[PDB]
Amino acid sequence: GTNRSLIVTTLLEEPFVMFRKSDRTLYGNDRFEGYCIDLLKELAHILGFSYEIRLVEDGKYGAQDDKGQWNGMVKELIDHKADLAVAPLTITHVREKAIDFSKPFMTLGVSILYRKGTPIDSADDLAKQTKIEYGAVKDGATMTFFKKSKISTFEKMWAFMSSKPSALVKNNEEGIQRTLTADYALLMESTTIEYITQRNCNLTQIGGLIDSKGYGIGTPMGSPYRDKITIAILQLQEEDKLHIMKEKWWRGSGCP
Amino acid sequence: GTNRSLIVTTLLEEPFVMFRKSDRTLYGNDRFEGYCIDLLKELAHILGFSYEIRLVEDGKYGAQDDKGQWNGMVKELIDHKADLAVAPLTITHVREKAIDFSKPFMTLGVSILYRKGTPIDSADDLAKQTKIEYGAVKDGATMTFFKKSKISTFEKMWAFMSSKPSALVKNNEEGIQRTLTADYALLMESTTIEYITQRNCNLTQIGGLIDSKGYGIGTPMGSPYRDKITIAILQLQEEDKLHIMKEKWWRGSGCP
Ligand SMILES: N[C@@H](CCC(=O)O)C(=O)O
Ligand SMILES: N[C@@H](CCC(=O)O)C(=O)O
Ligand SMILES: [Cl-]
Ligand SMILES: [Cl-]
Ligand SMILES: [Cl-]
Ligand SMILES: [Cl-]
Ligand SMILES: [K+]
Ligand SMILES: [K+]
Ligand SMILES: [K+]
Ligand SMILES: [K+]
């Protein structure tokens, strides 16, 4: 109880959480690597706790349906089926009504991922047409941002996204594949766009950031672990350790 | 320590925290009333704690200067000079890097307060001119939102606000007075606009909400009181007690 391993919910999302490469069949925690796994390992070392990582069954981050029921990792935390959600889980006002978060470990904002070609320059350019289809990950923070916005441009965008079946994708990977195979722009969080555009040289960020917010480790509301994790994060940041950790996982061969 | 009274920092802001009317000279906690004081009293009753309310000396909510130093209630918490900030303190990503917050007790967004007269309809209308001056409370969340925005309209607005000495006001009260005496629009949080426009019938909200976020009780990072306060808030909300509390302090004679 005071000594038990913490249950960690997560999902696969490069370069935050990935299946590490091996010839063996792997099991348990050893299956996973990435920026969020490195962060978890360092926190566990600093704070003297152990854990068991489990993939969220529905593969979702989490949003509310019309009855107010949650899904994804957010629901796992609400139900106390996990102690921590270690993932690029966006800290948002709607989620803070239901779960808690550590202090942010990374800053990001919503922006646009699109193929180099048609020289659109902002969300305003997308909103005023439909030839270039656009969308977001279903039941994530970006979708919820658009759904809740009262800014005219973004209201128009939500009207389109929410009317078009194909527009909301299962996960980043599906969305990225869609930008590569169709005339489709993905509304995506900016540090992920940074990672993707360094590796897929035909993709680019369109325009700037629409907002500026954070990823945090999610916990059930009132968790006894959340504060020590926050203080440890703060201290890692004071020493630039998270910047270094980001460089490790974002580092790579650029583009021509 | 386990029994000591909590130090509460606050500032005067109608109808959240006000000096109550009396013929006597009042002292101590008895000086204060309002929505946030009612919230504090209910939490203290539920949770079995006592407190001493102190007004933040600089009268500010809190923002960072160029060296990264904070002021206002945020600085009081960082310094552990207060245990709680009980006020309409906006929960923001930049603040979450330095302090913690309870779950939100109220939802709001940035909007525009302006005199009925010139029929402007949105921030876009303000941004494209300077005849109608506009601004925000200095060293509050709204100012910081504009300062950090990369949305073109809001960048233009920040360029203007930050160049014009008179534009950033000391507090809501100064800003409201300015809308009443000059051709000036105040960027203000929406539930306060709601309160003001019910009482000053010549003022109105212009356009909709630019964002949607929360007020929370601020605490130093890692506070031992923050979780129980969060759970108590949650339970007050499940029973609609905060909606009722808002109706109490926002209730009043409408306008013609
Ligand atoms: N990080 C997001 C998922 C990705 C997105 O919504 O763009 C979340 O926590 O919901
Ligand atoms: N509630 C704001 C102050 C008012 C404003 O910035 O509009 C804050 O916590 O900074
Ligand atoms: Cl698993
Ligand atoms: Cl860092
Ligand atoms: Cl005082
Ligand atoms: Cl309520
Ligand atoms: K253990
Ligand atoms: K393998
Ligand atoms: K006491
Ligand atoms: K008096």
Per-residue buried b or exposed e for A151-166, using 16+ beta carbons within 10 Å of the residue's own CB: bebbbbbbebbeeeee
Tell me if A104 and B91 make a contact (CB, 8 A cut-off): no
Interface test with A, best of B64, B78, B93 (most A CBs within 10 A): B93
Q: At what angle do helices B226-238 and B35-47 cross, to 10 degrees?
A: 110
| CA dist., res. A193 & res. B82, Å (int) | 40
Asked if A210's CB is within 8 angstroms of B151's CB, the reply is yes
Are B222 and A231 in contact by the 8 Å Cβ rule? The answer is yes
Nearest to A89 by CA among A62, A114, A120: A62
For residues A110 and A188, give the distance between their C-alpha atoms in angstroms, rounded to a whole number. Answer: 6
| Same domain? B119 vs B151 | yes
3-class secondary-structure state, position A206: strand
Integer Cα distance of B61 and A61 in angstroms = 33
Q: How far is CA A25 from the centre of its chain?
A: 27
Mutate to test the pocket of ligand 1, among A138, A142, A192, A215 (most ligand atoms within 8 A of CB): A142
Tokens of A108: 């990001």
Task: Give Cβ neighbours of residue A99 (< 8 Å, ≥ 6 apart).
Answer: A74, A77, A78, A218, A219, A220, A221
Tokens of B239: 């029973």
Method: X-ray
Same domain, A1 and A101: yes
Strands A110-115 and A203-206: antiparallel
Residue A246 and residue A181 share a domain: no
What are the beta bridge partners of residue B6?
B51
Rounded to whole angstroms, the Cα distance separating A45 from A24 reads: 26
Please tell me the distance between residue B121's alpha carbon and the centre of ligand 9 in angstroms.
51
Shared domain check, B119 and B104 = no
Ligand 1 near A141 CB (within 6 A)? yes
> Is residue A120 a contact partner of residue A126, using CB atoms and an 8 Å limit?
yes
Asked whether B56 lines ligand 2 (CB < 6 A), one says: no
Instruction: Using CA coordinates, name the residue in chain A closest to B151.
Output: A210
User: In chain A, whose CA is at the least distance from the CA of B104?
Assistant: A97
Which helix (H) or strand (E) covers residue B218, if one does? strand B213-220
Question: Where is B83: in which H helix or E strand?
Answer: none
Q: Is residue A113 within 8 Å of A176, Cβ to Cβ?
A: yes
Cβ pair A230:B209 closer than 8 A: no
B233 lines ligand 2 (CB under 6 A): no
The answer to whether residues B104 and B231 belong to one domain is yes
User: What residue spans of chain A are helical by DSSP H?
Assistant: 35-47, 72-78, 93-96, 123-127, 141-148, 152-161, 172-181, 190-199, 226-238, 241-250
What is the distance between the alpha carbons of residues B21 and B254, in angstroms, rounded to a whole number?
22
Tell me the torsion sign for CA atoms B98, B104, B106, B107.
positive
- Is the separation of the CB atoms in B139 and B146 below 8 Å? no
How many domains, chain B? Answer: 2
Is the beta carbon of B11 within 6 A of some atom in ligand 2? no
Sign of the dihedral through C-alpha B130, B122, B214, A127: negative
User: What tokens does B227 get?
Assistant: 């979780």
A232 and A131 within one domain: no
Name the token pair of A252.
């790579």
Alpha-carbon torsion A52, A53, A58, A64, what sign? positive
Q: Could you list which residues have their CB under 5 Å from ion ligand 3?
A: A 54-55
Tell the burial category of B72 from Cβ atoms under 10 Å away from its Cβ (0-12, 13-18, 19+). buried
Contact B135, B174 (CB under 8 A): no
Nearest to residue A185, comparing CAs of A163, A198, A203, A173?
A: A203
Q: What is the DSSP string of A18-54?
A: EEPP-SSPP-GGGGEESHHHHHHHHHHHHHT--EEEE
Q: CA-CA distance, B133 to B115, in Å (whole number)? A: 12
How many A from CA of A139 to the centre of ligand 3? 21
d(Cα A131, Cα A117) in Å, to the nearest integer?
Answer: 14
Phi then psi dihedrals of residue A52, to 5 deg: -130, 120
And the tokens for B142?
């709204």
**Phi then psi dihedrals of residue B248, to 5 deg:** -60, -45
CB burial string A126-139: b at 16+ within 10 A, e below:
bbeeeebbbbbbbb
Q: Determine the Cα–Cα distance for residues A228 and A157; give it in Å rounded to an integer.
A: 40
Residue B254: phi and psi, rounded to 5, are -70, -160
Residue written as tokens 């000059």? B182
With an 8 Å Cβ cutoff, is A230 touching chain B?
yes
Ligand 8 centroid vs A31 CA: distance in angstroms?
A: 8
Give me the residue from A122, A152, A212 closest to B93, CB to CB: A212
Specify whether the CB–CB gap between A161 and A135 falls below 8 A.
yes
Range of the domain at A222: 1-108+213-256
Q: Please name the residue whose Cα sits nearest to atom 4 of ligand 1.
A: A140
Instruction: Verify that B113 and B230 share a domain, yes or no.
Output: no
Does residue B240 sit in helix, strand or coil?
A: coil
**Burial environment of residue B151 by CB neighbours within 10 A (0 to 12, 13 to 18, 19 or more):** buried
Whether the CB-CB separation of A245 and A106 falls below 8 Å is answered with no
Within this chain, do residues A31 and A94 fall inside the same structural domain, yes or no? yes
Cα–Cα dist A59/B78, whole Å: 38
Hey, what amino acid is at A39? L
In this structure, are B45 and B113 located in the same domain? no
Residue with tokens 């000279």: B25
- Asked if B150 reaches chain A (Cβ–Cβ under 8 Å), the answer is yes
Q: Of A212, A232, A247, which residue sits at a domain end?
A: A212
- Rg, chain B, Cα only: 18
Indicate whether A233 and A171 sit together in one domain.
no
SS3 B181: helix
3-state class percentages of chain A: helix first, strand second, coil last, to nearest 5: 40, 25, 40
Angle at A109 between CA A103 and CA A115, to 5 degrees: 145
CATH code: domain of residue A220: 3.40.190.10
Q: Does A231 touch chain B (CB under 8 A)?
A: yes
By the 8 A CB rule, do B256 and B201 touch? yes
Q: Are strands B203-206 and B110-115 parallel, antiparallel or unpaired?
A: antiparallel
Which residue in the set B96, B152, B234 is minimally distant from A104, CB to CB? B96
Query: Taking a C-beta distance cutoff of 8 angstroms, is the pair B243, B188 a contact?
Result: no
Q: B126 and B85 in one domain? A: no
B111 lines ligand 2 (CB under 6 A): no
Residue-by-residue DSSP string for B18-45: EEPP-SSPP-GGGGEESHHHHHHHHHHH
Are both A121 and A240 inside the same structural domain?
Answer: no
Resolution of the solved structure (Å): 1.6
Instruction: Determine the Cα–Cα distance for residues A148 and A27; give it in Å rounded to an integer.
Output: 40
Tell me the longest C-alpha to C-alpha distance in chain A. 57
Smallest-distance ligand from the CA of A217: 1
